[PDB]
From a paper:
[name] regulates diverse cellular pathways—including cell division, DNA-damage responses, gene expression, differentiation, and small-molecule-induced targeted protein degradation.
Higher-resolution insights—including details of the active site—were obtained with a truncated version of [name], termed [name]ΔN. The mutational data also agree with our structure showing this ARM region binds the acceptor mono-Ub for [name] generation of [name]-linked di-Ub. Only substitutions in the proximal Ub-binding site substantially impacted [name] activity toward a mono-Ub substrate, in accordance with our biochemical data showing that the proximal Ub is the acceptor.
Numbering used by the authors:
A (entry chain A): 484 to 755, 762 to 799, 866 to 984, 1131 to 1156, 1165 to 1285, 1305 to 1358, 1373 to 1380, 1388 to 1415, ...
B (entry chain C): 0 to 73
C (entry chain B): 1 to 75
């Protein structure tokens, strides 16, 4: 202000040097200013003086600052653009005739900054032609600014005002084929806005498009890699759709210019149907364009109801039809493929409309030779039985047209695939809905009365076979072979299996146990496994091992069941707002609970209620306000719960949003009506004495139930197939528990149970921001994820876990990380910082996890004498603590003692536990001192809390655990058998197996009654194993390898004999797997549940938790995968020399150098699932900047680990690169000295 | 390896240790991590100019012990 | 006057040095004998970072002493 007046007086002067000094001072004052700092700055007086100063001719230096002053004034105070916009004539005059290029560039920058809010003034000022008249003389930035000005001016245009762009259209059209990204983007925006504004004027559209714009944009859309981005691709395709719809002549013109080839290339790919994966919006826009290029349907006939559910192309079709025939033949296949592989209410509807118009406007032969290698009848039958009264009408119309055009071909297919049956069902079983119901009824009645009125070796045969699976009647094994023949070699349909009761009968056959059944369940299961799969018949088990090979019939049955389930399912997918949710806020009223009244009565009325706020905020506000006392105070605010909230008879959890609290316990009413919340202040030890062990559980017996499990609530027409598939998967996983001797192998790997439609629906539902942000995921998805997880792959279940297991902030962060494409979502998370020392890492880690281990905020770890902080040290913390937890001194796991490779100064000589099958806990007997047990238990508790915290923060650990460990984690420790000893102790398992080879012989020989006591005794004593008898072995009741663990009391003077050997084996297995490793896992479970419950890990199998906790499996890299995600820039544009040498040199390691490189760059010696392509910041490679004296050869590379930024010198050889990339990775580790 | 000083209006001195080939956006992210200001309200000023994203420090000839300014926008 | 410089992992380098020798000369000798440039070497004695612009006599560094070398590369 005070200096502002002095500067204004300096501006209003005569001496040129005074003006120059004043303008430099004013620019300097404006640059560092701000809205608060520069309050009261005179804009009504400074601006006119600056304009008068700019209106000169005698100097080429004062103007470069006069323009800068106005630019900076607009930048600093975004409200001076009401007095600033008065020298548009002056800027345009300077643009008209050029004297200094820099003055023109600055004028362009000022105009670009002004156009964001005032474009109409520039438009009536005639700047559109003036900016582009000398477009070829400026530099890159001035050209970009000029095109931005053109776009912003053409955003708001009127039909009356067209001469401002009429003479400038050819320049932009010729500019549309440049190699610069941003110029192309701006020109395409200009064209899109022009077309949108001129949509109701056919003549103006013809003027704009002409015949060169179409050509240029057509080859713009095809070039790969794409110059355009996704959003601009969508905009350009929408421009095509709007242009074709509003004027049919350009639709004809594009149809005559082989647009079909471009659409085919965009959809499927290449010109030699594997569709290229694209976002739903792009597919919707392309389908809309395909639909628009086709003639429109008549408004009479059976199409009269479309008026209630809410030319030139036809002339060309009546003309030479070769073009139309080529179009239909080229596009029908891709249209059907898109329709059958997309789950969305818009894409499906658009594809359906396109299919109707294609079928209607084609003739007999074209439909005959297009609809050949396709299944249309099944789709029509599936879509008839739907709740929405749009798809039903579409299906009826398709059926009518197909019957009229091709009666002979489509008269057996409809009967075999259940279309006539569904039409008869519709024709026998507040005004628009009634009218469309009446139309549906009349149309179905007419169709039935006309086409299928008066009227087979597969349906009858299937009925005969399924009538022999009744429980009350014996069926032998002929029914099963008949069913196998029908399933494997026939043309049975999904409707026939429904009509002839097969799934229910088979389910009852496999999963029934009563007293009126004519055959026991065990014999039935063994007959099933003998017919499908090749297990022995009941009562005929061979002496050897049951290891059948063939599994084809079970796979065929699984595939048929999956197809039937896909055909029959009718699950809903809800996708669709954000601005409304982020703007409006909820309203609530507080009323005291009548039963108890001790706190003060509320009288304020409405309460500040954010939609995503937690009830903890309400409790804190009540405590601070003084209602909690039985002025604002912070002592109470600065855990123990003193107040509680209730709604009706339902308790409100503390970790619940107010929106969900209103929605569930108490829609337009949620955001309109006022709600009320009440507030109120808050044994003989048999194992040790006798020697008996608990029995082994059979996991299959809980799956073999006919009724649905208690977790299933939804009602769908495909529940029976889901239950049957669940039973079959249970049989496939657990079939060796039914035979005494069998090999532990799955009949069918679990990757072959994946359904291709439920996965698509789940993936689509897991992309809508609003449902993730509110928490409205449909019940069927979670219920199927927890009950039948084999339908979905691993990524879908992982995303579902991360979305439904934690708060909304973590869900939104995961969504943003996975889908970078996206009223804007913005997560808000807290962060806690802690400092550690690299000399007592375990103790300080334990303290950290005891204090902030269970908190709901992100944790970042910094070090004492280092200047690095962020996401690198945090990952290194886990990577080092996990390595520390494997020391041999602690005495926790099994295995051998090894020494690490490339250690630190003090890490040398430290023994680490190594095991080539994984890590499992050591057994502790009944004589262990309490101190040792307590130490082991506290270490295990810390480990459990560490993993539970690492999972929640999206970090990765480096601990190679074993399969029995995860079985214990998932509460499956009661079903462990001798097969699992190969994962803990290879050498004991062989002895156990050879000894189990003797008990079977002993039992078999004792089962023979044609002998005497002396003969029995001699035969039992004669049994030998590898030349030595059980007495010659000379063992005892001590667990093998550990001669201090007693199986039972007195196990030192009790030798194992042939009479008591089964007890010895059972005790050995139990003490090795469950008994001695119980106290050490109870502490782990207690620690893990301190963060979040273990019950949220039910989406995964024991063999899938390794990828969730640690990284992906090791793999050898190659240049192909490296040159698809690595992004080189800043001196190393692609196909350079340094990048080539580097890509050659990484793909030669042995996973140890891979670990070193990953630790050096990323900070953790692991990668997320998916490899390099899954890293959110791609590995960026840049050129290191040196001087002219020092050679850029005897230096070392550098890395910013927070963003994977690799700075790399331009070496003169590959040997030098090899010898100077290893020194950095080996001698430059465990340090953050540059941040 | 060079050290620079970032100074705010209230009066501080954040000593950032960076390298010439670093991106300005990374510097703004580090300032966010060290002070908490979101990396969208910042407007760095050097030699009476306004630094722009997408460039490197070596483009503007930033050297040892060069003082920048951090002016926030609302 | 043959002080020992120890790298991170296990390497020890003998280095002949004069009493009134600056840190720059020691860094240059280390570069000659090992190859690490005298820009990314950070010498630590006892528990202190050896500043540049003084001599080993100021830090009470004598014969048969051990120094630690840590590289300035990561961030």
């Amino acid at each position: 202000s005070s200096k502002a007046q002095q500067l204004l007086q300096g501006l209003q002067a005569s001496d040129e040097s005074q003006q120059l000094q004043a303008v430099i001072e004013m620019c300097q004052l404006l640059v560092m200013g701000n809205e608060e700092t520069l309050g009261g700055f005179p804009v009504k007086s400074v601006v006119p003086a600056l304009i008068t100063l700019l209106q000169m001719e005698h100097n080429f230096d004062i103007m470069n600052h006069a323009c800068r002053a106005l630019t900076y004034m607009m930048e600093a105070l975004p409200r001076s653009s009401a007095v600033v916009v008065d020298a548009i004539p002056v800027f345009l005059e300077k643009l008209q005739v050029i004297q200094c290029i820099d003055v023109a560039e600055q004028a362009l920058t000022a105009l670009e900054m002004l156009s964001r809010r005032h474009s109409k003034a520039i438009l009536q000022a005639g700047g559109l032609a003036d900016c582009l008249l000398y477009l070829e003389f400026f530099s890159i930035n001035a050209q970009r600014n000029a095109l931005a000005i053109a776009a912003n001016c053409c955003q708001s245009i009127t039909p009356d005002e067209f001469h401002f762009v009429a003479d400038s259209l050819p320049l932009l059209t010729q500019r549309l084929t440049h190699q610069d990204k941003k110029s192309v983007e701006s020109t395409c925006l200009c064209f899109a806005r022009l077309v949108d504004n001129f949509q109701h004027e056919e003549n103006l559209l013809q003027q704009v498009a002409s015949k060169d714009l179409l050509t240029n944009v057509q080859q713009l859309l095809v070039v790969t890699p794409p110059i355009l981005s996704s959003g601009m691709f969508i905009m350009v395709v929408r421009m095509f759709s709007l242009m074709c719809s509003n004027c049919p002549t350009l639709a004809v013109q594009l149809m005559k210019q082989n647009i079909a080839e471009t659409l085919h290339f965009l959809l499927c790919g290449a010109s030699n149907i594997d569709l290229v994966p694209r976002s739903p919006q792009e597919l919707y826009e392309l389908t809309s364009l395909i639909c628009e290029l086709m003639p429109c349907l008549p408004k009479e006939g059976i199409f009269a109801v479309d008026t209630m559910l809410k030319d030139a192309r036809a002339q060309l079709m009546k003309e030479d039809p070769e073009l139309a025939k080529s179009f239909i033949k080229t596009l029908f296949g891709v249209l059907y493929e898109v329709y059958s592989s997309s789950a969305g209410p818009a894409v499906r509807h658009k594809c359906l409309r396109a299919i109707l118009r294609i079928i209607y406007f084609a003739d007999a032969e074209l439909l005959k030779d297009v609809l050949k290698n396709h299944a249309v009848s099944s789709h029509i039958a599936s879509m008839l039985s739907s709740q929405d009264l749009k798809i039903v009408v579409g299906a009826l119309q398709m059926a009518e047209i197909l019957m009229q055009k091709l009666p002979d071909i489509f008269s057996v297919y409809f009967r075999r695939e259940g279309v006539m049956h569904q039409v008869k069902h519709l024709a026998e079983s507040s005004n628009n809905r009634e009218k469309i119901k009446g139309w549906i009824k009349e149309q179905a009645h007419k169709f039935v009365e006309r086409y299928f009125s008066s009227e087979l070796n597969v349906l009858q045969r299937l009925c005969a076979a399924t009538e022999q699976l009744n429980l009350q009647v014996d069926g032998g094994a002929e029914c099963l072979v008949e069913i196998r023949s029908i399933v494997s070699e026939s043309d049975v349909s999904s409707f026939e299996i429904q009509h002839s009761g097969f799934v229910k009968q088979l389910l009852l056959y496999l999963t029934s146990k009563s007293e009126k059944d004519a055959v026991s369940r065990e014999i039935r299961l063994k007959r099933f496994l003998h017919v499908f799969f090749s297990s022995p018949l009941p009562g005929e088990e061979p002496i050897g091992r049951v290891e059948p090979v063939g599994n084809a019939p079970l796979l065929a049955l699984v595939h048929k069941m999956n197809n039937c389930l896909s055909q029959m399912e009718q699950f809903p997918v809800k996708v669709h707002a954000l601005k409304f949710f982020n703007t409006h806020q909820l309203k609530c009223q507080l009323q005291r609970h009548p039963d108890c009244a001790n706190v003060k009565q509320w009288k304020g009325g409405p309460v500040k209620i954010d939609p995503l706020a937690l009830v903890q905020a309400i409790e804190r506000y009540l405590v601070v306000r003084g209602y909690g006392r039985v002025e604002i105070d912070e002592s109470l605010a600065a855990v123990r719960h003193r107040l509680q909230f209730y709604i009706g008879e339902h308790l409100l959890p503390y970790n619940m949003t107010v929106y969900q609290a209103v929605r569930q316990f108490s829609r337009a009413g949620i955001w309109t009506k006022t709600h009320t919340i009440w507030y109120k202040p808050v044994k003989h030890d048999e194992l040790w004495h006798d020697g008996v062990c608990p029995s082994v559980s059979n996991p299959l017996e809980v799956y073999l139930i006919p009724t649905p499990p208690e977790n299933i609530t939804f009602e769908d027409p495909s529940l029976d197939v889901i239950l049957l598939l669940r039973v079959l998967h249970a049989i496939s996983r657990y079939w060796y528990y039914l035979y005494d001797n069998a090999m532990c192998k799955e009949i069918i790997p679990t990757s072959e149970f994946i359904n291709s439609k439920l996965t698509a629906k789940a993936n689509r539902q897991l992309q809508d921001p609003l449902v993730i942000m509110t928490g409205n995921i449909p019940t069927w998805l979670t219920e199927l994820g927890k009950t039948c997880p084999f339908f979905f792959p691993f990524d879908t279940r992982q995303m579902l876990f991360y979305v439904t297991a934690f708060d909304r902030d973590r869900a939104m962060q995961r969504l943003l990380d996975t889908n970078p494409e996206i009223s804007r979502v913005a997560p808000r998370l807290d962060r806690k910082k802690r400092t550690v020392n690299r000399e007592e890492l375990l103790k300080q880690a334990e303290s950290v996890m005891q204090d902030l281990g269970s908190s709901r905020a992100m944790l970042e770890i910094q070090y004492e004498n280092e200047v690095g902080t962020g996401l690198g040290p945090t990952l290194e913390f886990y990577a080092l603590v996990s390595q520390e937890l494997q020391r041999a001194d602690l005495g926790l796991w099994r295995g051998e003692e090894v020494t690490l490779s490339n250690p630190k100064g003090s890490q040398e000589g430290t023994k680490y536990i190594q095991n080539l099958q994984g890590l499992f806990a050591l057994p502790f007997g009944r004589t262990a001192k309490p101190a040792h047990i307590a130490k082991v238990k506290m270490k295990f508790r810390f480990l459990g809390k560490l993993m539970a915290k690492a999972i929640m923060d999206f970090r990765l650990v480096d601990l190679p655990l074993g399969l029995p460990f995860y079985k214990w984690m998932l509460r499956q420790e009661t079903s462990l058998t001798s097969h699992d000893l190969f994962d803990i102790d290879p050498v004991v398992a062989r002895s156990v197996y050879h000894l189990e080879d003797i008990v079977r012989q002993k039992k078999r020989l004792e089962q023979d009654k044609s002998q005497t006591k002396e003969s029995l005794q001699y035969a039992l004593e004669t049994l030998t194993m590898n030349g030595c008898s059980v007495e010659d072995l000379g063992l005892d009741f001590t667990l093998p390898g550990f001669p201090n663990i007693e199986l039972k009391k007195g196990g030192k003077d009790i030798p194992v004999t042939i009479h008591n050997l089964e007890e010895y084996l059972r005790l050995v297995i139990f003490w090795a797997l469950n008994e001695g490793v119980s106290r050490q896992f109870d502490s782990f479970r207690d620690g893990f549940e301190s963060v979040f419950p273990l019950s949220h890990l039910q989406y995964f199998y024991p063999e899938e938790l390794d990828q969730l906790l640690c990284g992906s499996k090791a793999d050898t890299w190659d240049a192909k995968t490296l040159m698809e995600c690595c992004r080189p820039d800043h001196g190393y544009t692609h196909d350079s020399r340094a990048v080539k040498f580097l890509f050659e040199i990484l793909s030669s390691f042995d996973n140890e150098q891979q670990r070193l490189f990953l630790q050096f760059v990323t900070g953790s010696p692991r990668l997320p699932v998916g490899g390099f392509r899954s890293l959110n910041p791609p590995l960026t490679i840049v050129r290191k900047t040196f001087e002219s004296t020092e050679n850029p050869d005897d230096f070392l590379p550098s890395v910013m680990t927070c963003v994977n930024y690799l700075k790399l010198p331009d070496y003169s050889s590959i040997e030098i690169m090899r010898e100077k990339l290893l020194i950095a990775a080996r001698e430059g580790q465990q340090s953050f000295h540059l941040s | 390896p060079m050290q620079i000083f970032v100074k705010t209006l209230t009066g501080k001195t954040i000593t950032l240790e960076v390298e010439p080939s670093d991106t300005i956006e990374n510097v703004k992210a580090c300032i966010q991590d060290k002070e908490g200001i979101p990396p969208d309200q910042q407007r760095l000023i050097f030699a009476g100019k306004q630094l722009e994203d997408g460039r490197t420090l070596s483009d503007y000839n930033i050297q040892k012990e060069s003082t920048l300014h951090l002016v926030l926008r609302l």
